[PDB]
């Protein structure tokens, strides 16, 4: 029952903002939320208040253009 | 006494566990000490141990840091560093230890042990060096 989620939001670093979009495989969206926070805060040293998720949605496995996700979902 | 086979093991973790044993009152023998591994890069490690060998007391070298060049003594010295050496407790714990290169006949034909927490299996990196390599670099016998 594995779904594919798209995430869209914004994150801030040293006063400057930057939008982002990502895509994940999971069952629920709370797991997606936790993983977004973890990964972004690792790769740009950004806390969780300075991350603002504005959209989490479900899609199907051909409207996805990340190599790993696409090759795991076929 | 317990008998421990250093072969595929990590030096510092081995030493930490062994030193806690010693203080809790056991006798330990370590065999195949030339086969433990040290993790890092070769230049870094060799520089470290060379800089240690060439330490000495400028006024009299019959004093002086006597940092060793043999494998069994390298192991013994790490363990020592992990104990209170300036204390009767520690001196006795240290006297309860014995370290060998190879497996003497005396110990041949016996079942050895291995510490789970120390083992090359944990690693994810192909970067490791052996204590025998370090000894050969420094100029020690076996």
């Amino acid at each position: 029952e594995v779904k594919v989620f798209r995430v869209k939001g914004t994150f801030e670093r040293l006063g400057k903002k930057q939008p982002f979009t990502k895509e994940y495989r999971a069952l629920k969206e709370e797991h997606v939320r936790e993983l977004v926070y973890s990964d972004i805060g690792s790769k740009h040293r950004v806390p969780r208040t300075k991350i603002w998720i504005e959209s989490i949605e479900e899609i199907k496995p051909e409207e996805a253009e990340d190599p790993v996700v696409r090759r795991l979902s076929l | 006494m317990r008998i421990i086979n250093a072969e595929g093991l990590i030096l510092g973790r081995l030493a930490s566990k062994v030193a806690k044993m010693l203080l809790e009152g056991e006798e330990v023998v370590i065999v195949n000490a030339e086969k433990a591994i040290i993790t890092g890069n070769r230049e870094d490690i060799f520089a470290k141990y060379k800089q240690r060998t060439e330490l000495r007391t400028r006024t009299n070298p019959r004093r002086g840091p006597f940092y060793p060049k043999r494998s069994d003594e390298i192991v013994r010295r790490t363990v020592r560093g992990m104990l209170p050496w300036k204390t009767d407790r520690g001196r006795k714990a240290f006297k309860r230890l014995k370290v060998y290169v190879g497996v003497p006949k005396e110990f041949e034909g016996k079942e050895f042990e291995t510490i789970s927490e120390a083992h090359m299996s944990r690693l994810a990196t192909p970067k490791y060096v052996t204590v025998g390599e370090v000894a050969k670099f420094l100029g020690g016998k076996f």
């Binding site: 190599p67 790993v68 090759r71 795991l72 | 690693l123 994810a124 990196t125 192909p126």
Partner: protein, 183 residues
């Protein structure tokens, strides 16, 4: 993570026999054996259906590189046992003609620039040197053996003390396994 599960195959020819045994690849062919050791964490090597497969199940950049590298090495071994590798060198002199000789496992070059002391270049096991006039051949079955032999012979004749625009004599590589060398 560039990808998920990189894998690359190698088609095995008719007379060649590949086999893996404990992180050591072994290749037998119409002439000679060739063994080698290809080790990296998370990289496997096996035979599925007449192929050689190299696999890694969540690669970074420095895994992709290693995998394609192993690919190239095993292709080299196959083509080597199947055809062999051949190298050519050239000899040049302005004054002081020199003489090149083989004896056992060395290559002796005498009277190079008028020296009273010869120069010795090492041959490695499995490689045959052959002098024909001013041209030299080095033939063999392992790419690296043949290259190192050629390179030892060439480095035997090196100069560091005078201008190489005027002092150009020596022995030089001109074909590294069929491919020329131009400038």
């Amino acid at each position: 993570p560039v990808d998920a599960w990189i894998r690359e195959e190698i088609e095995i020819p008719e007379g060649v026999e590949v086999t893996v045994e404990g992180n050591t690849v072994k290749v037998k062919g119409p002439k000679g054996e060739l063994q080698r050791e290809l080790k990296y964490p998370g990289v496997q090597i096996f035979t599925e259906d007449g192929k050689v497969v190299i696999y890694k199940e969540f690669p970074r950049k420095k895994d992709v590189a290693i995998v394609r590298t192993f690919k190239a090495h095993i292709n080299n071994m196959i083509k080597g046992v199947t055809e062999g590798f051949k190298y050519r060198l050239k000899v040049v002199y302005s004054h002081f003609p020199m003489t090149v000789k083989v004896q056992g496992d060395e290559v002796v070059i005498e009277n190079f620039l008028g020296e009273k002391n010869p120069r010795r270049a090492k041959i490695l096991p499995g490689v045959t040197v052959k002098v024909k006039g001013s041209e030299i051949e080095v033939e063999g079955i392992d790419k690296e053996a043949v290259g190192q032999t050629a390179a030892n012979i060439e480095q035997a004749t090196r100069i560091t003390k005078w201008d190489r625009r005027v002092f150009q004599d020596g022995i030089y590589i001109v074909e590294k396994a069929g491919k020329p060398i131009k400038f």
